[PDB]
Symmetry: C5
Subunit: 311 residues, 5 copies
């Protein structure tokens, strides 16, 4: 079968709808997520119009092979979606109501700048390519756009699932293409990061600052260097796959700062020891006493600056 | 072929049954489990009724293509099930007995609050979407619901496999959906956690408390900081992928408390040393002596409170 | 097509055979193994019997579609096997000789109690479900059961590949099922565990016992605590994915004992130091001197008890 | 069908085009990348020519089976591509315009010599094998070569996607092969390596150099050996799967140098201590004082030499 | 169709050829490698004979379905090769020339005894099972055996790709099988192991030997025990998945020896300290002085013995 002909020169409108049944496997490192949903399609085919009285039914059911069906695809998918046609209904005026259930792995970039206090807009791009006999344009049927109440993404809060009504019409490979943007907004559940990651990492850093209440060089070396090892080992324990970004992130800046702090603490411990050995205890004592305040104060200030710069 | 028509207006009843053959890959991180089972279906189609005397047969066998079959799907699956039709039998009255063997990856959320002493109810939701001509409703054949004796889930005790008899009937995209809840009750085998994880982790923490029987600051620094490293290294060794939860868990609270305890132990060691150096040994001695009791007592008390709050 | 009818009321016997070509990927954690083999099937169909006089051919070759073939499946597989029909031969009396080459991922539970000195019996369960007209029973053709000489399983010694001749006949989903048990006996190659894992782990433990020849508390703390870190780090290096078991294992008991030994060694080091500081060197000296013998002796004794208890 | 015959002795020209829709999974370890693209093909088959006036149509649409299609394959793919034919249009002169959407895993070697400041040229080799009746030659339509604006490779800057116009024509197994080289130029986003990896690794090395301002052998041993552990632990934390190369790399040379530096620092600490103990403090003091300058200077010089040799 | 009949009772010869296009993913742990190659087949089927004058063609082209094709399989594959048929050419005498491009994961055992200075012979076994009407025998067409110049295996040098001309003909399940051995000779690129693994590991061991130039027990304990931790941590950093072997390997022996050396160094440090404390400094001094030579000498000697025993 070939596409329905226009009455006049008009393009064929395909009314679309996506209804989320399941969302899962949001992979931060791959920048992908898996979706299981309904894809509803609607268009007019006058060749399928009938008289309900002379035919004996109010609705007609067809097998996909029996009628012409627009070839709809997703742009940002890894491999083509897994689809099962659920229903094909034709109304007296020739209106076709198509419904399929599909599953797909969607490629959608993420912004890590505010991780782990970030929000993301996931995109699902629907596309149709025009045929020789006529142009095909996509539209959104808002009554057929939504999500199941029990839809969840582990580690995320689902904000909304909507579609940008106006399609993007453009030329690709010498034909017109009609593209729709379906948007899934999510915000990361940051709660667990506080007791699990941030607080223990700060405790380890605070342990190193005890070296400012000790004049024992051997003990101070153990304090600063062993806490540095504990910090690295803790980071191995707690690490999750985050991809390499061409921009600076909030977490990246803090982590770099923590390393810088271990380094400066070694400098202080080295300087305090050298001055004592070189018969200058007054200088050594005033540097250590200032460090007791300078280290937590500079750390608190830098964090406020970073929090302000990123949020 | 379209669905069988009704006698009066009554909906078509599809009698369901799921029999577990294999259960495997219960992934705590992904909150999924794989299942290999039988799906039995039964309904009556009058258009299939025959005279056994004329036909010379008491039962008729059909290929799926030859007859109308209800489109049954699973709600909480990653991809649509891989199914192999085993048998289709039609009796003289038009009763169809359908049987398939299928494999599916099921998405079912887990409650980690009581991990590793948790129990879970895994769900397998069966669904049917109604058609234009008639409404399709699902029913449970509790007799045809079971599991093979050899069915095992590594690390779990399988309690029961059943279904909630009453289906959930609701509207979705202008059509009725009939949903059945099949429930697989499991409880975690916690035994191994005691010698493998809990006891060695406690031993490492108890080692740090020996610093309260020593006035050597250099030895105490090594004790507390090196045990903190041992704790982290031990946690790397025994870790399993638990996902990040928006709620506090029993294990999460304990682990945080263990870090807090290493931190407070450093504080004590720092304070005891500072008072000795600042010519106050009486204060330093009474703080260390109180710590010998305060540390195990507060630890035992906090654990009882947490165990009470979570169980 | 439909099954061959019986002459008298006798069930149809399907003579089976499995011949191993390749065995691989024995996954201890998943409790699965992959197999590549031949599945030979043989049964009698009188409708296919032909007179060798007015025909021409000695044996007739058929395509799977042309004739009735029993639906044979594996019980303990993840997904249905990938099979390629190699040959279908029909002899004058209607004896059908079927041959396929298949690959499958088999789910077979393992007993870890004696790991790494364990032996396992891997099972491949063949099954047939009976039909409306007649009952189907499985049998073993011993001349068609075996394995290729080159068959190897990395890390294991293949003892034998046999079948339990008597099938297990039972009811399931209102029909008779005939199940055969094919057994692949294997024993773990434990050799490498001795130089790679056991010996270095013992050396690390023996290092901690040197603390009984030293009265230096600072050195003893480093000895016991740093060896505990070395032990944990070594275990991270050599670990393999053994699953969590509801029973105690030989390795599990030894590893727990090693942790207990590090703990008791800290106790001793703590006690020896405390007694010296509390003007009791005689007691401290006799505890350390006894520990020099008590630690290796108790360790040797406990190991003998455990080895006896598990073997 | 067989290929269109030649008018004179000329080969059949197949005009090719590749348009990138998605690029993902650039695996440095496997030296592979996944691609989702359009493959456009164009050639003339005179047997397909028609009269538009008689036919009443200006374009003819065909199913792949109905007409002869050149067998185009990729050389450097893991498996054959997953392709979906989108369009086949025939114009009155017999010009065929073919379009498919495909996904493929491409094997393309990477040069690690300049990692992480490297640039790579990814190759996608298109090939056609000639037939008995006629020679098939590939051509590029650079207009039909491009990429979607949203195409991204995590951690890389996509510079260009082009084709080398001249195909490589050669004999293989007694037939002509026409090969086209499609090139995807990428350059690694090195920014993040500076704060995340290089700077913390240098800080850890600088900590070891503080041993040159201390005469305490116990503190110096801890400084050098504990920083060596911190360096190794840090490398475990921030590391990606680079494959083993038969050539020396920039990163490989630097990392080796860092280990050599830890070794020489131990030598210095050992020598300084030995001379002091052997009543030679003047020598010990001058070696340590020279090391304060020698270590950073030699490190800065060697890095300049390496940077010059590799860039 | 069925196989071509014999003129007399001669077997059917199938001339084979394998031409390597790509080789990749040599997995040491799984003992597998992936291959992308051409499989060329040639045999005579007189039923396909034609007169070039009548047909107007000197060569005929067929689709796989249209003619009888020998069922060729690989013995040592995981699943079955997935091939796409490239060409089928029949000459007037009925000589068929078949060509397919395939991809396959091949299971081929590796000898780790000499790792990482090892060489391997990878095998690809081609097989054909004979039929009732006639025996099928495999042959090698040497003009159709080879590899593309660009063929590479990351981490390996490809020496040669050849076939053992004489097939292995044997009986299996009452039928003849004709097996060919295709051999891919490779040698490991060991270069990178020298700066990346061997040299840093030796440096760490040499650091422990500095304890023989120090009488400080506390410093010596830190030296030997902390280097042991560095060694283990380094091994975690550089480790690759070698499988467990029932035989001793060169690398296995060296690694065991390194652990033994750390153990004996602790013994020495323990003995030296004990003798000093037990008023025997002369003995302690001569043991330490002998160790300065004994440790590097015994290490150099044992390595020479091991290198001789393994090479
Ligand atoms: Cl799609
Ligand atoms: Cl489903
Ligand atoms: Cl199966
Ligand atoms: Cl391809
Ligand atoms: Cl194969």
């Amino acid at each position: 079968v070939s596409p329905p002909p226009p009455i006049a020169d008009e393009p064929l409108t395909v009314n679309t709808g996506i209804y989320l049944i399941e969302s899962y496997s949001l992979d931060d490192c791959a920048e992908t997520f898996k979706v299981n949903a309904f894809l509803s399609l609607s268009w007019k085919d006058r060749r399928l119009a009938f008289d309900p009285v002379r035919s004996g039914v109010r609705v007609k059911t067809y097998e996909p092979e029996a009628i012409w069906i627009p070839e709809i695809r997703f742009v940002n998918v890894e491999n083509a979606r897994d689809a099962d046609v659920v229903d094909i209904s034709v109304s007296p005026d020739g209106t076709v109501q198509y419904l399929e259930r599909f599953s797909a792995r969607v490629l959608s970039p993420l912004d890590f700048r505010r991780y782990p206090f970030d929000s993301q807009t996931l995109h699902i791009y629907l596309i149709v390519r025009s045929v020789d006999t006529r142009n095909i344009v996509l539209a959104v049927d808002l009554e057929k756009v939504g999500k199941n109440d029990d839809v969840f993404l582990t580690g995320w809060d689902i904000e909304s699932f909507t579609a940008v009504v106006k399609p993007a019409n453009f030329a690709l490979e010498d034909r017109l293409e009609s593209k729709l943007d379906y948007q899934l907004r999510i915000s990361r559940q940051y709660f667990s990061y506080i007791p699990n990651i941030i607080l223990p990492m700060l405790f380890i850093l605070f342990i190193s600052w005890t070296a400012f209440w000790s004049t024992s060089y051997e003990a101070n070396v153990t304090l600063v260097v062993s806490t540095l090892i504990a910090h690295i080992a803790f980071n191995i324990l707690v690490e999750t796959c985050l991809p390499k970004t061409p921009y600076m992130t909030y977490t990246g800046a803090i982590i770099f700062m923590i390393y810088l702090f271990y380094f400066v603490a070694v400098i202080e411990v080295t300087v305090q020891h050298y001055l004592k050995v070189e018969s200058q205890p007054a200088r050594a004592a005033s540097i250590t006493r200032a460090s007791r305040i300078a280290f937590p104060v500079v750390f608190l200030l830098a964090n406020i600056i970073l929090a302000f710069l990123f949020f």
